[PDB]
Design a protein around this ligand. Structure first.
Ligand SMILES: *[C@@H]1O[C@H](CO)[C@@H](O[C@@H]2O[C@H](CO)[C@@H](O)[C@H](O)[C@H]2NC(C)=O)[C@H](O)[C@H]1NC(C)=O
Lengths: 215, 158, 87
């Protein structure tokens, strides 16, 4: 279900940078969304503190620069930005994009002395069912669309879950599509320079709360 | 320091008591004494749960109290709450034996989830009662339908 | 303030056949009779006002009592009535 996606839109015109993130030191937990109050299990990497740290990693990757000739190459120079120029945000396939890659959106909470009516849990549960939504129907009414202006399908950014119970995920998948530039050597050079810096950053990213791998 | 007692003839509702009950006023049977529960709903009283909770609050150190009432009215809106603490245990106490839901509700806001639960019991901030089935409590019970209300005590004609 | 003149009341009031036998009788939801009180605005709105004014005293009574469920307020009133005019 994953290669179908990289073979329909990306390859061979787009290369993919991909990370698998686990949270080896974090317990799963159980949450009750308003108004049904049923017990919903949430996997270790869907802990709120883990998600803020994964988003720290993801934002740092977006900020990674590489030197090439006299230029500073950014990911924005070489990335699939589907809604350019209009919207220059790089496509990031990540569970964090349900919150538009924002710390404050991730922390959005509507509650009182009695209930928590809406939070990241309920936004997650809704968004994985309707990734193209502009309004999660909750009291927070937050959108589901990624910052690049398109849907993030749950089976591309999660792993280790049973059936369609995405909330049971034990791994996060983060995918950065990058232009292959097969037609263009000079852009390719710049893309490869950025890539070398990204591999090195991610392979020695120091955070014992996270286990970051490739493939 | 005295509970008012309402006296009715044909339609004369005079808020009296036995601190007045004229020597011509007739109480010949205990069957003439009735307690009634009346509902607090209508204009200016919000119905959605987020607005409704603003009338209630959690408090510790105060023991819950119950008082019976014998008749009440149809309620347009009732509430039925279930709340987990952050650690997953129960926030509201189970309904004590013999306490059932308010018996006549047009509509029940029946909701469940989790919340901060910053106290032992949930009370009414306006000093009203949570009306259950012919019992009025100072407190909210888990999964049990209530109407908000107040109680009066009357002397009915023979 | 705030007054609903209509009183669509319920109360308890089956003495025919085996219906008085708990096993055969109505369930908890089915022991009530209903009625509609109407164009008695002065009475009904007066009732709402009385229940409202009663609350502070009742609440203070309940704070001071140590029994969990108070059933005896009306019987106590009846006694006080008799102690007044015969004590
Ligand atoms: C009895 O009726 C009065 C009058 O409506 C209610 O008083 C309100 O009390 C709250 C809190 O003390 C105030 O915020 C409102 O402004 C009051 N309304 C007024 C002054 O018109 C009182 O809550 C009622 N009691 C019960 C048990 O329902």
């Amino acid at each position: 279900l994953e290669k179908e996606y990289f073979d329909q839109h990306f390859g061979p015109f787009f290369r993919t940078e991909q990370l698998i993130i686990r949270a080896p030191l974090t317990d799963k937990h159980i949450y009750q969304p308003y108004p049904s109050g049923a017990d919903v299990p949430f996997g270790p990497p869907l802990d709120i503190q883990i998600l803020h740290q994964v988003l720290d990693l993801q934002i740092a990757i977006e900020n990674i620069t590489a030197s090439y000739d006299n230029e500073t190459v950014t990911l924005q120079d070489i990335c699939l930005a589907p809604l350019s120029p209009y919207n220059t945000n790089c496509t990031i396939l990540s569970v964090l994009n349900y919150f538009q890659n924002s710390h404050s959106v991730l922390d959005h909470k509507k509650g009182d002395d009695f209930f928590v009516y809406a939070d990241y849990h309920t936004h997650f549960l809704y968004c994985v069912r309707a990734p193209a939504s502009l309004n999660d129907t909750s009291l927070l009414h937050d959108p589901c669309l990624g910052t690049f202006g398109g849907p993030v399908f749950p089976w591309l950014v999660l792993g280790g879950y049973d059936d369609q119970n995405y909330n049971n995920a034990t791994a996060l998948v983060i995918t950065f599509p990058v232009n292959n530039y097969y037609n263009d050597t000079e852009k390719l050079q710049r893309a490869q320079a950025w890539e070398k810096e990204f591999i090195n950053f991610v392979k020695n990213y120091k955070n014992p709360n996270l286990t970051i791998s490739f493939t | 320091r005295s509970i008012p007692l309402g006296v009715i003839h044909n339609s004369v509702l005079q808020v009296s008591d036995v601190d007045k009950l004229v020597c011509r006023d007739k109480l010949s049977s205990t069957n003439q004494l009735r307690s009634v529960g009346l509902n607090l709903e209508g204009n200016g009283v919000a119905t959605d749960v987020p607005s409704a909770t603003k009338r209630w609050g959690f408090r510790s150190g105060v023991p819950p109290k119950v008082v019976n009432y014998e008749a009440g009215e149809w309620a347009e809106n009732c509430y039925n709450l279930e709340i987990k603490k952050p650690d997953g245990s129960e926030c509201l106490p189970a309904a004590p034996d013999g306490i059932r839901g308010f018996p006549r509700c047009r509509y029940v806001h029946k909701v469940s989830g989790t919340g901060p639960c910053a106290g032992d019991f949930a009370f009414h901030k306006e000093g009203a009662f949570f009306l259950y089935d012919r019992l009025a409590s100072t407190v909210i019970y888990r999964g049990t339908t209530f109407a908000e209300g107040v109680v009066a005590f009357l002397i009915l004609p023979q | 303030p705030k007054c609903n003149p209509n009183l669509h009341y319920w109360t308890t009031q089956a003495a025919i056949g085996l219906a008085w036998i708990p096993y055969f009788g109505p369930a908890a939801e089915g022991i009530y009779t209903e009625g509609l009180m109407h164009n008695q605005d002065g009475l009904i709105c007066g009732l709402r006002q009385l229940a409202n004014e009663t609350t502070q005293a009742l609440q203070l009574f309940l704070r001071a009592t140590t029994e969990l469920r108070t059933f005896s307020i009306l019987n106590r009133k009846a006694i006080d009535f008799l102690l007044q005019r015969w004590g």
